[PDB]
Design an enzyme around this catalytic site. Structure first.
Site, PDB file in Angstrom:
ATOM      1  N   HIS A  42       0.813  -1.131  -0.218  1.00 20.52           N
ATOM      2  CA  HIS A  42      -0.131  -0.100  -0.028  1.00 20.52           C
ATOM      3  C   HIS A  42       0.943   1.173  -0.168  1.00 20.52           C
ATOM      4  O   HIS A  42       2.098   1.228   0.136  1.00 20.52           O
ATOM      5  CB  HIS A  42      -0.943  -0.068   1.137  1.00 20.52           C
ATOM      6  CG  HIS A  42      -0.435   0.349   2.402  1.00 20.52           C
ATOM      7  ND1 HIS A  42      -1.113   1.152   3.356  1.00 20.52           N
ATOM      8  CD2 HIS A  42       0.528  -0.081   3.163  1.00 20.52           C
ATOM      9  CE1 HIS A  42      -0.413   1.496   4.325  1.00 20.52           C
ATOM     10  NE2 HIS A  42       0.778   0.667   4.174  1.00 20.52           N
ATOM     11  N   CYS A  96       3.454   5.368   6.011  1.00 22.53           N
ATOM     12  CA  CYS A  96       3.452   4.052   6.667  1.00 22.53           C
ATOM     13  C   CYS A  96       4.948   3.668   6.374  1.00 22.53           C
ATOM     14  O   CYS A  96       5.592   3.817   5.543  1.00 22.53           O
ATOM     15  CB  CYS A  96       2.535   3.181   5.804  1.00 22.53           C
ATOM     16  SG  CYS A  96       2.698   1.445   6.769  1.00 22.53           S
ATOM     17  N   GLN A 114      -7.742  -3.077   9.515  1.00 23.09           N
ATOM     18  CA  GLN A 114      -8.807  -2.146   9.537  1.00 23.09           C
ATOM     19  C   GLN A 114     -10.019  -2.631   8.347  1.00 23.09           C
ATOM     20  O   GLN A 114      -9.424  -2.978   7.396  1.00 23.09           O
ATOM     21  CB  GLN A 114      -8.343  -0.835   9.423  1.00 23.09           C
ATOM     22  CG  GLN A 114      -7.532  -0.430  10.531  1.00 23.09           C
ATOM     23  CD  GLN A 114      -7.367   1.219  10.541  1.00 23.09           C
ATOM     24  OE1 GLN A 114      -8.560   1.930  10.643  1.00 23.09           O
ATOM     25  NE2 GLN A 114      -6.535   1.719  10.566  1.00 23.09           N
ATOM     26  N   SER A 137      -6.842   5.614   9.672  1.00 26.75           N
ATOM     27  CA  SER A 137      -5.287   6.117   9.365  1.00 26.75           C
ATOM     28  C   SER A 137      -5.083   7.048   8.443  1.00 26.75           C
ATOM     29  O   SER A 137      -4.048   7.593   8.413  1.00 26.75           O
ATOM     30  CB  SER A 137      -4.608   4.684   9.169  1.00 26.75           C
ATOM     31  OG  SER A 137      -4.531   3.686  10.210  1.00 26.75           O
ATOM     32  N   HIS A 140      -5.428   5.036   1.383  1.00 28.09           N
ATOM     33  CA  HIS A 140      -4.568   4.259   0.884  1.00 28.09           C
ATOM     34  C   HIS A 140      -4.596   3.906  -0.729  1.00 28.09           C
ATOM     35  O   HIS A 140      -5.916   3.929  -1.097  1.00 28.09           O
ATOM     36  CB  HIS A 140      -4.747   2.894   1.577  1.00 28.09           C
ATOM     37  CG  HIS A 140      -4.640   2.807   3.178  1.00 28.09           C
ATOM     38  ND1 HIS A 140      -3.836   2.298   3.958  1.00 28.09           N
ATOM     39  CD2 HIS A 140      -5.722   3.312   4.033  1.00 28.09           C
ATOM     40  CE1 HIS A 140      -4.095   2.431   5.066  1.00 28.09           C
ATOM     41  NE2 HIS A 140      -5.236   3.157   5.222  1.00 28.09           N
TER      42      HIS A 140
END
Ligand SMILES: Cc1ccc2[nH]c(C(=O)O)cc2c1
EC number: 5.2.1.8
Length: 146
Positions: A42, A96, A114, A137, A140
Site C-alpha cells: 500500500h 507508513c 482495518q 489511518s 490508501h
C-alpha cells in the site's frame, strides 16, 4: 456477471460505459476479469484527521483530508500512466513504515486489518490496484501482489 463490488456506469465526459468497484474504488474502461490469505502493498497518505497524524516522513502531519485525496489521485494517475511505478512512489511518499519495503505488508487473513482495507484487499484480484481507500489511518492505494 461481474465480480464482487463491480458495477457498470456511464462516463460523464465521453458517454462511454465504464466499470467501477464500490469496495476497492477501482475504475476502468475494460470489463473486469475466496483465498484464506492475500498479500498486499500500500501507499498511505495521512491527513490532520488520521488516528495517528505523524509518520517517518513528517513529525506533524497537517495536510487536510482533501489535500491528502489530491495527493492520492496524483499518485494513481502516475501509476496508471506508467510515469512512475507503485513501488517507487510507495518508497518515496507513503506515510507508513512499510514504505521502506516498497509498501509491502506481507500476507494477511480476514480479521487482521482495518475493515475498509481488508475488504478492498480481498476484492482485488492478484495484480490489481485499488482506488482511494479511506480508513481511520488515512487514505490508501492498495496493490494486491498474491
Ligand atoms: C489498514 C492499515 C494498514 C497499514 C497501516 N499503517 C498505518 C500507520 O499508521 O503507519 C496504519 C495502517 C492501517
Amino acid at each position: 456477471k461481474l465480480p464482487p463490488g463491480w458495477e457498470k456506469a456511464m462516463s460523464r465526459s465521453s458517454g462511454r460505459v465504464y466499470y467501477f468497484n464500490h469496495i476497492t474504488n477501482a475504475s476502468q474502461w475494460e470489463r473486469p476479469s475466496e483465498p484464506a490469505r492475500v498479500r498486499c502493498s500500500h501507499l498511505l497518505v495521512k491527513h490532520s484527521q488520521s488516528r495517528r497524524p505523524s509518520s517517518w516522513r513528517q513529525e506533524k502531519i497537517t495536510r487536510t483530508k482533501e489535500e491528502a485525496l489530491e495527493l492520492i489521485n496524483g499518485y494513481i494517475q502516475k501509476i496508471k500512466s506508467g510515469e512512475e511505478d507503485f513501488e517507487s512512489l510507495a518508497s518515496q511518499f507513503s506515510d507508513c513504515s512499510s514504505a521502506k519495503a516498497r509498501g509491502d505488508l506481507g500476507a494477511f487473513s480476514r480479521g487482521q486489518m482495518q475493515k475498509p482495507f481488508e475488504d478492498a484487499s480481498f476484492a482485488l484480484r492478484t495484480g490489481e490496484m485499488s482506488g482511494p481507500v479511506f480508513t481511520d489511518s488515512g487514505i490508501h492505494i492498495i496493490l494486491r501482489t498474491e
